[PDB]
Amino acid sequence: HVQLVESGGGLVQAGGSLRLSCAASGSIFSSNAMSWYRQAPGKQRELVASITSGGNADYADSVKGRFTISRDKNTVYPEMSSLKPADTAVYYCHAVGQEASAYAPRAYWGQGTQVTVSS
Amino acid sequence: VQLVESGGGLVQAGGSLRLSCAVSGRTFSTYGMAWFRQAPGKERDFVATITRSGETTLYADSVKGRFTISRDNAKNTVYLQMNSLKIEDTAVYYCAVRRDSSWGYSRDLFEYDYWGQGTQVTVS
Amino acid sequence: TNLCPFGEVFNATRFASVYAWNRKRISNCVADYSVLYNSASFSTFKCYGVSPTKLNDLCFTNVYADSFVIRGDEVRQIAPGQTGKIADYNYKLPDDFTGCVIAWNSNNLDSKVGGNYNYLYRLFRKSNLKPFERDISTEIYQAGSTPCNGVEGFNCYFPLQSYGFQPTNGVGYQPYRVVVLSFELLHAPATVCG
């Protein structure tokens, strides 16, 4: 099993910038593309970002640029800036899990990270 | 429709022969001819090949510069000459015409048709 | 004098997956073919739309570097006018494809004995991909009465699977690293020349 959990969350300031760091610790890893999704009340899952194995990353028009992800040596470096009250949501991470048909035939869906703007 | 390989026999030291290999088909343009050495129950070595451009050519690490490669368009006959024979250059010669139509610089055997009869020589 | 960024692409320690083939830009740089040939010795080379010797003076506007890894027996899949699992459900290209492709082998370099499942590939997908299209989703391809669950086995097809590559396997089953230089000679400024 691969534990992709990074952090529970934290406070967000007006026009803040948070630089998370993936633990990248657990079982054997692989150069598998990842996806970054958003959730919130009244809205379904949204395709916010999709990053390949270090080649390039595709982002939605709303989230283009002001959220970014980089892949290097099986490591994810997120760069976030210009956070506004509209960003209060839950982040979801989607990865690829193959050796999981023995005891947990489920996709490696990381725990949702709640983010809210509050001084 | 099968590839013809005339000649053969045995050649001792200080001898020469022309390996006349002919293609029955009339689509010689689309055949990316390529050659490789054949061995009995052993890995098949790579051999130089004539580039589709004609003027240029290719060199193989195992053997290079000792084969009179000559493209033919009238009767699709190639006379593969052998010179400067050596244990490294001595093996079961085979004419393996490639049915694929593409530029060929490959070094693998995954893209060849068949190994029907082959030819070789006997040295005392 | 600008150094072309080709060494990293041709000397990368790791390679991307088939469903996430690495894509890189090549422009505003000067490269020499003689030095590359002297220092690089590839295994399989195939060029369509331009002769290998014509690149000496051609002023290519831009180039796309697509790097990935496939199975040896699947090497035939990557070609114009070809239909197959790799061509359709994993990576589709235009029928009139033009450009160069160089394929080599890393059997000795990547001779990782014991569970060499570092390479993953999509078994199947509901629909057929279009040219220059890619996806990294993990949608479950049910297409049947089986419950919509991610179970690998009979009567339940997982979206992805790990290739069974081993050093002792057959030659056709050995991995093959493929780098494709795609040329787009459109009405754009020229930036690459000899």
Tokens of B8: 């053969």
A3-to-A22, A74, A97, C121 alpha-carbon distances in Å: 10, 14, 11, 22
> What residue has token string 């506004």?
A84
Picking from C33, C42, C44 by the largest number of B CB atoms within 10 A of its own CB, the best residue to mutate is: C44
The overall longest dimension of chain A from CA atoms, in Å, is 46
Tokens of B45: 């070595």
Taking the CA of residue A31 and the nearest CA in chain C, the distance in Å comes to: 6
- Residue B25 carries which DSSP code? S
Tell me if A99 and C117 make a contact (CB, 8 A cut-off).
yes
| Whether C17 and C87 share a structural domain | yes
Q: What angle do CA A96, A102, A106 make, to 5 degrees?
A: 40
> What residue has token string 């530029």?
B103
Pairing of strands A9-12, A113-117: parallel
Please name the amino acid found at residue C19.
Answer: Y
Tokens of A46: 């949204």
B62 touching chain C per CB within 8 A: no
| Whether C145 and C183 share a structural domain | no
| Whether C162 and C181 share a structural domain | no
| Whether C56 and C126 share a structural domain | no
| Whether C125 and C188 share a structural domain | no
For residue A11, with 0-12 CB atoms within 10 Å meaning exposed, 13-18 middle and 19 or more buried, which class applies? Answer: exposed
| Whether C99 and C119 share a structural domain | no
| Whether C102 and C175 share a structural domain | yes
Tell me if C151 and A105 make a contact (CB, 8 A cut-off).
yes
Resolution expressed in Å: 3.7
Tell me if A98 and C117 make a contact (CB, 8 A cut-off).
yes
The top-level CATH class assigned to B1-102 is mainly beta
- List all residues 6 or more positions away from C15 whose beta carbon is below 8 Å from its beta carbon: A31, C22, C67, C68, C69, C177
A98 touching chain C per CB within 8 A: yes
- Alpha-carbon gap, residue C58 to C193, rounded angstroms: 6
Experimental method: cryo-EM
Pairing of strands C44-48, C22-26: unpaired
Buried b (16+ CB within 10 A) or exposed e, C150-181: bbbeeebbbbbbbbebbeeeeeeebbbbbbbb
| Whether C12 and C95 share a structural domain | yes
Question: DSSP states of chain C as a string?
Answer: --B-TTHHHHT-SS---GGG-EEEEE-S-B--HHHHHHH---SEEEEESS-GGGGGT-----EEEEEEEEESTTGGGSSTT--SHIIIII----TT--EEEEEE--TTTT---S-----EEE---SSPPPTT-----------SSS-S----BTTB--SEEE----TTS-STTSEEEEEEEEE---SS------
For residue B48, with 0-12 CB atoms within 10 Å meaning exposed, 13-18 middle and 19 or more buried, which class applies? Answer: buried
Measured between beta carbons, which residues in chain B are less than 8 angstroms from residue C171?
108-110
Tell me if C43 and B107 make a contact (CB, 8 A cut-off).
yes
| Whether C95 and C126 share a structural domain | no
Chain C residues at the A interface, defined by Cβ less than 8 Å, are: 14-17, 19-24, 115, 117-118, 120, 134, 136-138, 149-153, 158, 160-162
Domain of residue C140 covers: 115-166
Ramachandran region, residue B58 (left: φ > 0; alpha: ψ -120 to 50; beta: rest): beta
What is the domain partition of chain B in residue ranges? 1-102
Q: Which residue of C has its CA nearest to A53?
A: C16
> Distance from CA of residue A27 to its chain's centroid?
19
| Whether C154 and C187 share a structural domain | no
Tell me if C76 and B105 make a contact (CB, 8 A cut-off).
no
Whether the CB-CB separation of A70 and A2 falls below 8 Å is answered with: no
Q: Which CATH superfamily is domain A9-117 in?
A: Immunoglobulins (2.60.40.10)
Q: Do A and B share at least 3 CB pairs under 8 Å?
A: no
What is the domain partition of chain A in residue ranges? 9-117
| Whether C109 and C186 share a structural domain | yes
Number of domains in chain C: 2
| Whether C60 and C139 share a structural domain | no
Pairing of strands B18-22, B4-6: antiparallel
